[PDB]
């Protein structure tokens, strides 16, 4: 199994720099809008304790400065939702998909293309850790950089990067602006939850060991969904949710192996450890898969 | 700290799909050539001992089925070079990018464009293995789907995709038809030569470790080069060369840690293991980075 981005092509198409005075972070342009992070519009100053809406009162279309490349896009409109600056432009992207806007949870993963001054770096998947954070490779002039699943023709854009942690983490917000996690734009220090095990993803790494004919761990009991929250908890895992359960239903039926009976066997494993043995050649238990990207790498 | 692709839509605006027969896989669309390969040409029965030259110039152009999205292109001329098979068709590809076809060395690393049916569908890092072959993520109809590095505007292409290995690691072709390692078009099951690992890079990683604030690795002990490479060997390390010492010259720098040193840390790890403990979250000693990529992100 590898970590598998998924093709960046339609973001590449999206990408723009936005640029209040010397401040340049990237802004994402669908239609006629460019959506960025509203931290562009801050001075040194005003970043400890902004005042937004002050400052985007004294703020004029004619303040800011959208690039495609080194051509000028000229905003005719700006807003504020949340914690996105919306800038209306006079031209629509022609390069625009089909979007959608999701906001995900915790667990789930994406693909961030990494910018810097509107021009793409890199890419890779990340997944969204239970305490809303995700652990990227974000550099200066990483802002506004996004987060993005493709299904069909059709991206489904989840993530804006906004801010770094102490620690070193990352955080940022769906596209409507709002921060995944207790965290705000202000540069104040800020601590992210004690992170934990994303559950279901270890179950889809397990589902996905069984795939492989890698099945030593099967028990031959089951458990109630509350036992094993409760017993999970002691080990730093995540509680399961109603959505957790139904999300391994595909792969429940492909192995035949009910959700209940397979975290029976990781409790076991929890409790009594791997005892010298390996899952899928590692004696690490990973969580960065989801059973959706399980099914991507095996069918 | 993270492995990273490139940002793969320059190459997204070349994929087709290319059909012969009962076998679709997919062409990369340059210009007025589509690039495949040549084992399209070859029914079920054919793979076992295929006579390629035979096979070819039994095929007409009419014979190949090239699809961009919604549109057959028609082809009008088709030859072979290598284990690749060229296909000229009557349109240029308006979204050709800068490009060059270079022959990557073992060690060193590229993106793939995973792509099925003639689209894209997943993009990640792979090293050139030193037994020549990558431990991919390719699945049936993956064929054709090719590897490349960016550097400004130019797309490097140094790899198309032809089999999987009994062991499930894969191996292919450049640009140019030429395998990578001992390997056939050949419906036959092939294995390679023994592999060993890429020893700078897991150096350049090491040093990633450290600037991510992992340490405990380290140590006061350091070593000489041969004597290094000694124990290198013996675990079925690649040797660093002074070329590779050089290289690592930037991360040295920057973290005020002789390369020397370095691998001495390495030497432990190899003699000793890593006792439970992990290094950027790994059990295992990562070799699939190389001290480019790691200053690039670092
Ligand atoms: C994009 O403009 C950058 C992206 C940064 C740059 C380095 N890596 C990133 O993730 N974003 C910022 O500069 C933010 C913007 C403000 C409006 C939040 N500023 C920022 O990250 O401030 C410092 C952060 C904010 C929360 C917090 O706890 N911070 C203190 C901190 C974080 C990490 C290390 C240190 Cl020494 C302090
Ligand atoms: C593209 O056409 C593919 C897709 C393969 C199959 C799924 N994953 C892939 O990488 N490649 C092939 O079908 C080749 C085509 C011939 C003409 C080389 N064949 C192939 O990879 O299958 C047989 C391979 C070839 C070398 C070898 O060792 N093989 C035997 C083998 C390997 C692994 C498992 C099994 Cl059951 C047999």
């Excluded at 990237?26 to 304790?49: A, F, K, Q």
């Excluded at 506004?144 to 991206?155: A, E, H, K, L, M």
């Excluded at 559950?199 to 031959?220: E, K, P």
């Excluded at 192995?255 to 899928?280: F, P, Y």
Aim: contains cysteine; glycine residues 8%; aromatic residues 10%.
């Amino acid at each position: 199994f590898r970590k598998m981005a998924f093709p960046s092509g339609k973001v590449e198409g999206c990408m723009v720099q936005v640029t209040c005075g010397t401040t340049t972070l990237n802004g994402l342009w669908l239609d006629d809008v460019v959506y960025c992070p509203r931290h562009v519009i801050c001075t040194s100053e005003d970043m400890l304790n902004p005042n937004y809406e002050d400052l985007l009162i004294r703020k004029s279309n004619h303040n800011f400065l959208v690039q495609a490349g080194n051509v000028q896009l000229r905003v005719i409109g700006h807003s504020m939702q949340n914690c996105v600056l919306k800038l209306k432009v006079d031209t629509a992207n022609p390069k625009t998909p089909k979007y959608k806007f999701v906001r995900i949870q915790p667990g789930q993963t994406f693909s961030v293309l990494a910018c810097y001054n509107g021009s793409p770096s890199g890419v890779y998947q990340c997944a969204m850790r239970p305490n809303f954070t995700i652990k990227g490779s974000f550099l200066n002039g990483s802002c506004g950089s996004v987060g993005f699943n493709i299904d069909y023709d059709c991206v489904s854009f989840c993530y804006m990067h906004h801010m770094e942690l102490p620690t070193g983490v990352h955080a940022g917000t769906d596209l409507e602006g709002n921060f995944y996690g207790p965290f705000v734009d202000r540069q104040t220090a800020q601590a992210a939850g004690t992170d934990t095990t994303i559950t279901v993803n270890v179950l889809a790494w397990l589902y996905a060991a069984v795939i492989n004919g890698d099945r030593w761990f099967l028990n031959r009991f089951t458990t109630t969904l509350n036992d094993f929250n409760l017993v999970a908890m002691k080990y730093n895992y995540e509680p399961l949710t109603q959505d957790h359960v139904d999300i391994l239903g595909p792969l429940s039926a492909q192995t035949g192996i009910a959700v209940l009976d397979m975290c029976a066997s990781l409790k076991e494993l929890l409790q009594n450890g791997m005892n010298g043995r390996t899952i899928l050649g590692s004696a690490l238990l990973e969580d960065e898969f989801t059973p959706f990207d399980v099914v991507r790498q095996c069918s």
